[PDB]
């Protein structure tokens, strides 16, 4: 038996004032022996030595503390075996601490179809910029004609599609969508026009 190959899908995000969040996927080959953990190392782009942040990580994610806002950090993860750590996986580009994580951008071109006397089927596109955190679903609001007071239609939805139901026969409705990531919900999207029943 031998050492594992390198971890996969090494990404970062959730950049705060003094931390960054690393996320990865297991290696393709364990070496013939089950893995024991992961090694997480950092190295500021203007410094020459990798320093070990943590060892024997069992999760597929790690939050690195104690980062100095306005530096740039490299990161690499390896996988642990009965034989010791395997080859390292690197982040794609340095982590820059000045730009914190925020709320996601508004979703894109909202569309509608399948209108009934009671329901409408709405689709939309994911936003371009998630704000530095992965998107955790979407929120759909509807606003009746005789009002400007929006009401959430159901619960968050991970898909970029939702069938709105519970609509009153013959009434006029416009719909808008917000995306959500870790630090909350986007400024709402480009609203639709008012649509009735059939």
From Swiss-Prot:
The protein's job, in short, is:
Key component in the assembly and functioning of vertebrate striated muscles. By providing connections at the level of individual microfilaments, it contributes to the fine balance of forces between the two halves of the sarcomere. The size and extensibility of the cross-links are the main determinants of sarcomere extensibility properties of muscle. In non-muscle cells, seems to play a role in chromosome condensation and chromosome segregation during mitosis. Might link the lamina network to chromatin or nuclear actin, or both during interphase.
What does the record say about domains?
ZIS1 and ZIS5 regions contain multiple SPXR consensus sites for ERK- and CDK-like protein kinases as well as multiple SP motifs. ZIS1 could adopt a closed conformation which would block the TCAP-binding site.
Could you tell me the superkingdom of the organism this chain comes from? Answer: Eukaryota
Which compartments is it annotated to reside in? Cytoplasm; Nucleus
Report what the protein is called: Titin
User: How is the protein modified post-translationally, according to the record?
Assistant: Autophosphorylated.
Tissue occurrence: Isoforms 3, 7 and 8 are expressed in cardiac muscle. Isoform 4 is expressed in vertebrate skeletal muscle. Isoform 6 is expressed in skeletal muscle (at protein level).
Its family remark reads: Belongs to the protein kinase superfamily. CAMK Ser/Thr protein kinase family.
Assembly information from the UniProt record: Interacts with MYOM1, MYOM2, tropomyosin and myosin. Interacts with actin, primarily via the PEVK domains and with MYPN. Interacts with FHL2, NEB, CRYAB, LMNA/lamin-A and LMNB/lamin-B. Interacts with TCAP/telethonin and/or ANK1 isoform Mu17/ank1.5, via the first two N-terminal immunoglobulin domains. Interacts with TRIM63 and TRIM55, through several domains including immunoglobulin domains 141 and 142. Interacts with ANKRD1, ANKRD2 and ANKRD23, via the region between immunoglobulin domains 77 and 78 and interacts with CAPN3, via immunoglobulin domain 79.
Q: Where is the Fibronectin type-III domain?
A: 6-102, 106-198
Reported disease: Myopathy, myofibrillar, 9, with early respiratory failure: An autosomal dominant myopathy characterized by adulthood onset of weakness in proximal, distal, axial and respiratory muscles. Pelvic girdle weakness, foot drop and neck weakness are the main symptoms at onset, but ultimately the weakness usually involves the proximal compartment of both upper and lower limbs. Additional features include variable degrees of Achilles tendon contractures, spinal rigidity and muscle hypertrophy. Respiratory involvement often leads to requirement for non-invasive ventilation support. Cardiomyopathy, familial hypertrophic, 9: A hereditary heart disorder characterized by ventricular hypertrophy, which is usually asymmetric and often involves the interventricular septum. The symptoms include dyspnea, syncope, collapse, palpitations, and chest pain. They can be readily provoked by exercise. The disorder has inter- and intrafamilial variability ranging from benign to malignant forms with high risk of cardiac failure and sudden cardiac death.
What organism does the record attribute this protein to? Homo sapiens
Instruction: From the UniProt record, report the name of the gene that encodes this protein.
Output: TTN
Miscellaneous notes: In some isoforms, after the PEVK repeat region there is a long PEVK duplicated region. On account of this region, it has been very difficult to sequence the whole protein. The length of this region (ranging from 183 to 2174 residues), may be a key elastic element of titin.
């Amino acid at each position: 038996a031998m050492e594992p190959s390198a971890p996969k899908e090494l990404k970062f995000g959730d950049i705060t004032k003094d931390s960054v969040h690393l996320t990865w996927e297991p290696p393709d080959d364990d070496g013939g022996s089950p893995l024991t953990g992961y090694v997480v190392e950092k190295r500021e782009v203007s410094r020459k030595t990798w320093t070990k942040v943590m060892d024997f990580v069992t999760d597929l994610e790690f939050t690195v503390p104690d980062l100095v806002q306005g530096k740039e950090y490299l990161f690499r993860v390896c996988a642990r075996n009965k034989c010791g750590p395997g080859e390292p996986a690197y982040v794609d580009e340095p982590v820059n601490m000045s730009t914190p994580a925020t709320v996601p951008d508004p979703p894109e071109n909202v569309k509608w179809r399948d209108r009934t006397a009671n329901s409408i089927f709405l689709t939309w596109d994911p936003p371009k910029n998630d704000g530095g955190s992965r998107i955790k679903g979407y929120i759909v609001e509807r606003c009746p004609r005789g009002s400007d007071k929006w009401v959430a239609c159901g619960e968050p939805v991970a898909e970029t599609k939702m069938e709105v139901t519970g609509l009153e026969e013959g009434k006029w409705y416009a719909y808008r969508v917000k995306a959500l990531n870790r630090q909350g919900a986007s400024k709402p999207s480009r609203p639709t026009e008012e649509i009735q029943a059939v």
